[PDB]
């Protein structure tokens, strides 16, 4: 399942965010009357990648232009935020990896767990789009929350050729301080996860939501056409 | 497959190592006229853990008095330092969960892919044997590498109740200073792996070496009752 493209909000000021998770990105917030949403598009460096987490708050889309993103995808889904899937109670959950192609578009909604990681030895790029659901609170920028979040932990690029320097309470932070923003997000790679394995389930590999998408994309195309209508910030 | 007990060198001045892999190390090394090898009674804190490894200079032991700890280890062998298990060529390698027991005895050969994590909620505690090969240098201690490595890139513990901080240089020099101890050390947890399956092949199971740690625990109790044809510092 391939998608053409997702263009990006062009603001005034660009957001970009070295995440503590070893991700570059330029991220924005937009929403409609009908819907609200963050978008990055990112630059992935060798071994960069969030550790398995779970989200409560959005549906997310990812988008490998190049392919060589490895993802992993549980099937089980985990509705209840309280019950971490960790060897403490609740349990360590399955994973499956998927080798990205390009311009694959994957969707996984809500209370599903996943990650990624660029295992390649060069910098590959990606782009997420993370949904507000309908279960999901008011946050200043009304997307869910998801760019609150980034812009709380990690540290803002200021100089693209010198990248910051990430620090122990970053990391740490994107751990303790992703409940707040509807994510259950792991501090080590095996903590929620109980197996990986190479053969992807047929009804992970068919999930699908173009519409939203669709819409999304329609919202920030109306965004960079000036219609006063729809927001971006 | 268990053992009774690894006692531990009495030195004057204990080396107590905080490892960049999140491990409390109190660490010695030992050689008699026909072996030489390093030792270390470990905590391994929540998460605690390094990434999968090979060994080109030792083979080592791993023993867990309380379980708890789950190791990681490939069927597979590597006996080319210079070929990586990496995506760019030589590949990723299948790995196996051990859910360990209390007391038991883990023997794993140089070459063999391996790394552990503590995945529960309390501090555990594990003893690392690692024993010079046939084909390690001569390092100081004559023990094979490994306390020199430990050493050399981890802070000292100088107050087990205000553990140092690790910086971005230790972590980094983890990786980057291993292949000069006879390790290739991953810098993430999927860079070198493909799958994790929790079914242990039986071939792996069985993998035992008792002679030669009977043999290192005798250095060691004459090294502690005063013998002088020993050495442990």
Same mark, same amino acid.
């Given at each position: 399942h391939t998608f053409d493209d997702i263009p990006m909000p062009k603001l005034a000021d660009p957001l970009l965010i070295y995440t503590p998770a070893n991700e570059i990105f330029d991220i924005a917030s937009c929403s409609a009357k009908d819907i609200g949403f963050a978008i990055a598009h990112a630059q992935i460096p060798p071994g960069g990648g969030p550790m398995p987490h779970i989200h409560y708050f959005i549906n997310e889309w990812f988008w490998t232009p190049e392919g060589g993103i490895e993802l992993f995808h549980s099937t089980k889904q985990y509705?209840?935020?309280?019950?971490?899937? $960790? $060897?403490?109670?609740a349990g360590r959950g399955d994973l499956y990896s998927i080798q990205s192609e390009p311009k694959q578009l994957i969707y996984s909604p809500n209370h599903y767990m996943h990650g990624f990681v660029n295992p390649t030895d060069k910098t590959l790029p990606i782009v997420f789009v993370w949904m507000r659901n309908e279960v999901a609170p008011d946050f200043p920028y009304h997307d869910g929350g998801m760019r609150e979040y980034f812009q709380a932990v990690g540290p803002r690029i200021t100089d693209l050729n010198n990248l910051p320097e990430l620090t122990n309470a970053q990391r740490a932070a994107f751990a303790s301080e992703a409940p707040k923003y509807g994510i259950n997000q &792991? &501090?080590?790679?095996?903590?929620? $996860?109980?197996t990986i394995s190479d053969k992807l389930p047929a009804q992970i590999a068919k999930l699908k939501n173009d519409k939203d998408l669709e819409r999304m994309v329609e919202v920030i195309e109306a965004f960079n056409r000036g219609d006063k209508s729809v927001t971006c910030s």
């Open positions: 509705p209840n935020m309280d019950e971490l899937p $960790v $060897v403490g109670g &792991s &501090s080590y790679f095996m903590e929620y $996860v109980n």
